[PDB]
Design an enzyme around this catalytic site. Structure first.
Site, short mmCIF file in Angstrom:
data_model
loop_
_atom_site.label_atom_id
_atom_site.label_comp_id
_atom_site.label_asym_id
_atom_site.label_seq_id
_atom_site.Cartn_x
_atom_site.Cartn_y
_atom_site.Cartn_z
N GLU A 115 -21.22 -32.38 -1.32
CA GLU A 115 -21.27 -31.05 -0.72
C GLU A 115 -22.27 -30.21 -1.51
O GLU A 115 -22.95 -30.71 -2.41
CB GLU A 115 -19.88 -30.41 -0.68
CG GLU A 115 -19.29 -30.12 -2.05
CD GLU A 115 -17.83 -29.72 -1.98
OE1 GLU A 115 -17.55 -28.55 -1.61
OE2 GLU A 115 -16.97 -30.56 -2.29
N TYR A 164 -12.31 -27.12 6.83
CA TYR A 164 -11.31 -26.09 6.60
C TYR A 164 -11.55 -24.92 7.55
O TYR A 164 -12.67 -24.69 8.02
CB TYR A 164 -11.34 -25.59 5.16
CG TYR A 164 -11.33 -26.63 4.05
CD1 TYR A 164 -10.89 -27.94 4.28
CD2 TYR A 164 -11.74 -26.30 2.77
CE1 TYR A 164 -10.89 -28.88 3.26
CE2 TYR A 164 -11.74 -27.23 1.75
CZ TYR A 164 -11.31 -28.52 2.00
OH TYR A 164 -11.31 -29.44 0.98
N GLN A 177 -14.21 -32.56 4.79
CA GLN A 177 -13.63 -31.25 4.48
C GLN A 177 -13.94 -30.33 5.66
O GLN A 177 -15.05 -29.82 5.79
CB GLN A 177 -14.20 -30.70 3.18
CG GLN A 177 -14.39 -31.73 2.09
CD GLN A 177 -14.57 -31.10 0.73
OE1 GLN A 177 -13.92 -30.11 0.40
NE2 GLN A 177 -15.48 -31.66 -0.06
N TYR A 206 -6.49 -29.78 0.21
CA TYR A 206 -7.07 -29.31 -1.04
C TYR A 206 -6.14 -28.29 -1.68
O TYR A 206 -5.55 -27.46 -0.99
CB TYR A 206 -8.46 -28.68 -0.84
CG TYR A 206 -9.04 -28.19 -2.14
CD1 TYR A 206 -9.67 -29.07 -3.02
CD2 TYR A 206 -8.95 -26.85 -2.51
CE1 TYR A 206 -10.19 -28.63 -4.22
CE2 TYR A 206 -9.46 -26.40 -3.71
CZ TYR A 206 -10.09 -27.30 -4.56
OH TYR A 206 -10.61 -26.85 -5.75
N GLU A 263 -6.01 -21.00 -2.15
CA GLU A 263 -6.32 -20.93 -3.57
C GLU A 263 -6.05 -19.53 -4.10
O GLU A 263 -6.46 -18.54 -3.48
CB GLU A 263 -7.78 -21.31 -3.83
CG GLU A 263 -8.18 -22.70 -3.39
CD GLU A 263 -9.66 -22.78 -3.09
OE1 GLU A 263 -10.04 -22.72 -1.90
OE2 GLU A 263 -10.45 -22.90 -4.05
N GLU A 264 -5.37 -19.44 -5.24
CA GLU A 264 -5.11 -18.14 -5.84
C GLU A 264 -6.41 -17.42 -6.13
O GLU A 264 -7.38 -18.01 -6.61
CB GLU A 264 -4.27 -18.31 -7.11
CG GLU A 264 -5.02 -18.88 -8.31
CD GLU A 264 -4.93 -20.39 -8.40
OE1 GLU A 264 -4.08 -20.98 -7.70
OE2 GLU A 264 -5.71 -20.98 -9.17
#
Ligand SMILES: [Ca+2]
Length: 876
Positions: free
Chosen positions: A138, A208, A206, A303, A252-253
């Protein structure tokens, strides 16, 4: 550190759930900070691939300590493989490439690249006895040097990627370890798949968020691009469907804009555990998704699997950061998603219900798949050669087979619809996609045509009855009738068969007829074939490419005399309507086989919208469908389908009167030696294109071009065009064409200076507001030319020149041929040291050269002969 030996494990059997665990969320890495509460070793049984995704800035020596000695044996006991994830970079070197940064120890050489591959496997897979390697491809992983893409590095990675491939994976020396490619690219923009595909076990994409699912949107054409099915098809030629896995993402945080995918449930205060609920999300939709062809997919992955159970926020709502805090995952999303895929129609087992004859099952599992989603999706060839088959029941469940082969199945008695694939007849895709769709999209809209399975039958010595009625087969090929000795009752009706003259279908049909009648069974009720509607095709070639015409007054229809006909798959041209009336009455045993229903207007193709291009010998082109033979020319006639405007379906050769050789444009793609015109626009004056909407201008109000013919020739005509109807009176009004007298090349070192300042000869000058000016030229064999134009407008009049043609015949050394003739009309002019008839003998061998250069059937060899004759007589 002592690392345990690998726990024994089952082979992977799909569907598969994977998950990218991030190393800084193991409580052994950095607990005073990032994470005190999570651990990779707590991953559930439902995870099949646990991906170690590591922040390479940092060491976490206790994590790798804990991973190899405690986490890996724990996961292997539940049957969870542990996969090391490394960046694309690591296979290239330079600028954060891990092991490959040691460019001296592992140089970019054929043997250094093998060395780097062994070092990569040992350092990243073998050191902690992990289960495989995952290289993600990527933008974040792309090879760089000093923050800039390395075309060198990408090319090197293709070499290391397959050195790794012969060390681990399906083609490697250690097939226990898995070799995996992870990517965000569609195959077209994956520089590493094609050489790398034979070397990988699984391939992950991937995709998303919204754009992963619905694809990208083409705003111009208002449709979706890079869809799920498009992405699968791009990769479908490198991998098998069971190798394909799709990925969603957890929140994701502290993720920023761009990394807000909304692949899991959004926060809702009133349901504190709405994340960990999975119905209606993209993750579930991905778990349910299956490509419409090939077969069922291998699984899905996630992920940030350590974030399992955290809900997504939505930005324009609450600013509350209460979701960025780190908590412990019970991995409820992951468990639910794995169970969705296993309790799915697609992954059900092909069993006795579907194919009770087991020799037929064992021939279906291995060539189609073990699962029922493959009967409704398989895309290729199923050959049945095992004679021990007792019954072909269940092939009706095959919905998209490309080719069914029945070979030596003696014990099979009857063939009908119930023992053939459903796409023996025209069908449409019955599968409904599961994904959300673009809301302003005009693509899809309708079901898709399922191509009809090709059927090959040979060796069924026990076949008695054969029924293919109402199946719309175009042909009977693949049926070796000469081996179907047991045939008794046959039906080929309501198809699109040709069955006539010496059509190969007939050879098959008649061979069956003999067998059926040799059993004593011609009776109409047995062996029927009527109501055929053969599809009419455009002929692959057209026979008439020349027609000699006299000189008279008519208007000949070129299409009616050159472009006609309709062909069948078995090859039956019917150029005229009457041919079909003879066709419908062609008979078997006294029986018409072409349907009464089916007329000539339904069978014959239509040349209605086809279009014409007739070029004369002076290289002039009109677009008219009917020609006037009033005066003499030789033409070139081309026909173009509406499918392609610039590739001729047929080319012909019309000769009105005496044949005239076809002249060429000596000037196409000529090179701009000089002038004052725009160089990028001037080269389009010779690009062999008239309606240059690519802006064919040159200057402001008055321009000039000096150009060189690529191949010097014998010039005898020219024409030039104005900007189509694209303009009004901007039309050029004065034009001056000049040529160069060779010798005057002042200093052959340069080409531009010695010509922009020298003496030329004016070959034609022109005045008029005409659209297309064409004119013959009194010979001329120059190489360097000048064209000057003027639209008689003011300064800032922006004169244009679409296309100029310097037209003639290609005769090498044409200049010298003309200057020696010049040196001959030289000598014959004077009478000094010339006898009266001795001069005469010269004057004839001069005009003989003139007449050769003027016979419109240009004979280069003969011109050169008469030239050498006149040239030698000048020598004395
Ligand atoms: Ca042009």
């Amino acid at each position: 550190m002592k690392v345990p030996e690998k726990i024994p494990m089952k082979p992977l059997k799909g569907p598969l759930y994977g998950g990218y665990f991030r190393t800084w969320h193991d409580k052994t890495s950095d607990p005073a900070e990032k994470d005190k509460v999570n651990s990779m070793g707590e991953l559930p049984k439902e995870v099949d691939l646990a991906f170690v995704f590591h922040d390479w800035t940092k060491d976490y020596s206790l994590f790798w300590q804990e991973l190899a000695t405690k986490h890996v044996p724990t996961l292997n006991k539940q049957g969870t493989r542990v996969i090391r994830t490394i960046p694309w970079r690591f296979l290239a070197g330079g600028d954060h490439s891990g092991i490959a940064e040691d460019a001296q120890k592992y140089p970019n050489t054929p043997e250094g690249n093998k060395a780097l591959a062994k070092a990569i496997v040992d350092e990243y897979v073998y050191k902690y006895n992990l289960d495989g390697l995952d290289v993600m491809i990527e933008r974040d992983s792309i090879p760089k040097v000093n923050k800039e893409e390395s075309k060198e590095g990408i090319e090197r990675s293709i070499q290391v990627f397959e050195e790794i491939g012969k060390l681990i994976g399906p083609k490697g020396a250690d097939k226990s370890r898995l070799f995996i490619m992870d990517s965000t690219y569609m195959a077209d923009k994956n520089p590493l798949i094609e050489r790398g595909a034979p070397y990988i076990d699984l391939l992950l994409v991937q995709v998303y968020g919204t754009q992963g699912e619905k694809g990208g949107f083409d705003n111009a054409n208002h449709k979706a691009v890079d869809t799920m099915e498009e992405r699968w098809e791009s990769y479908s030629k490198y991998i098998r469907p069971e190798q394909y896995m799709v990925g969603f993402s957890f929140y994701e945080e502290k993720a920023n804009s761009g990394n807000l995918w909304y692949d899991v449930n959004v926060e809702d205060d009133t349901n504190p555990n709405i994340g960990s609920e999975i119905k209606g999300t993209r993750a579930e939709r991905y778990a349910k998704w299956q490509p419409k062809t090939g077969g069922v997919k291998g699984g899905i992955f996630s992920y940030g699997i350590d974030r399992d159970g955290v809900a997504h926020p939505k930005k324009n709502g609450p600013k509350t950061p209460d979701l960025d805090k780190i908590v412990k995952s019970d991995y409820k999303v992951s468990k639910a998603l794995k169970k969705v895929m296993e309790n799915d129609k697609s992954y059900e087992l092909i069993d006795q219900k579907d194919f009770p004859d087991k020799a037929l099952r064992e021939a279906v599992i291995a060539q189609v798949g073990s699962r029922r989603g493959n009967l409704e999706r398989f895309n290729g060839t199923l050959r049945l050669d095992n004679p021990d088959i007792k019954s072909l029941e269940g092939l009706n469940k095959l919905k998209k087979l490309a080719k069914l082969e029945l070979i030596g199945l003696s014990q099979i008695t009857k063939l009908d619809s119930s023992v053939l694939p459903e796409n023996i007849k025209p069908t449409k895709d019955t599968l409904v996609s599961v994904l959300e769709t673009y809301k302003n999209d005009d693509r899809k809209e309708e079901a898709k045509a399922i191509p009809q399975v090709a059927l090959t039958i040979s060796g069924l010595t026990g076949l008695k009855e054969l029924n293919l009625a109402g199946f719309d087969r175009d042909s009977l090929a693949g049926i070796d009738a000469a081996s179907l000795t047991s045939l008794e009752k046959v039906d080929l009706s309501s198809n699109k068969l040709d069955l006539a003259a010496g059509t190969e279908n007939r050879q098959i049909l008649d061979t069956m007829l003999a067998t059926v009648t040799k059993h004593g069974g011609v009776s109409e009720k047995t062996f029927v074939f009527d109501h055929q509607k053969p599809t009419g095709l455009y002929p692959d070639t057209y026979g008439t490419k020349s027609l000699q015409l006299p000189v008279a007054n008519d208007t000949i229809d070129l299409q009616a005399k050159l472009l006609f006909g309709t062909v069948t798959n078995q090859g039956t041209l019917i150029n005229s309507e009457a041919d079909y009336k003879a066709y419908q009455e062609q008979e078997i045993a006294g029986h018409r086989f072409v349907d009464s229903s089916y007329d000539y207007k339904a069978f014959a193709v239509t040349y209605k919208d086809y279009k014409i291009k007739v070029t004369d010998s002076t290289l002039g082109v009109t677009d008219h469908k009917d020609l006037s033979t009033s005066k003499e020319e030789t033409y070139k006639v081309e026909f173009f389908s509406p499918i392609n405007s610039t590739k001729p379906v047929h080319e012909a050769k019309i000769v009105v009167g005496e044949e005239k050789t076809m002249m060429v444009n000596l000037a196409e793609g000529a090179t701009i030696i000089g002038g004052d015109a725009d160089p990028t626009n001037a080269k389009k004056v010779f690009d062999g294109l008239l309606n240059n909407d690519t802006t064919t201008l040159s200057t402001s109000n008055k321009a000039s071009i000096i150009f060189e013919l690529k191949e010097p020739g014998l010039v005898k005509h020219w024409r030039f065009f104005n900007d189509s109807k694209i303009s009004k009176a901007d039309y050029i009004k004065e034009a001056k064409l000049e040529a160069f007298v060779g010798h005057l090349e002042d200093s052959s070192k340069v080409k531009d200076s010695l010509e922009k300042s020298t003496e030329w000869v004016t070959v034609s000058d022109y005045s008029g507001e005409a659209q297309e000016f064409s004119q013959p030229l009194n010979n001329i064999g120059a190489k360097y030319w000048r064209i000057t134009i003027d639209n008689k407008k003011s300064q800032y009049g922006y004169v244009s020149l679409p296309e100029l043609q310097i037209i003639g015949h290609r005769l090498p050394e044409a200049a010298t041929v003309m200057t020696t003739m010049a040196a001959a009309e030289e000598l014959s002019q004077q009478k000094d040291k010339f006898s009266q008839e001795q001069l005469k003998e010269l004057e004839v061998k001069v005009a003989a050269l003139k007449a050769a250069l003027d016979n419109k059937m240009f004979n280069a060899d003969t011109i050169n002969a008469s030239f050498a004759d006149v040239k030698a007589y000048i020598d004395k």
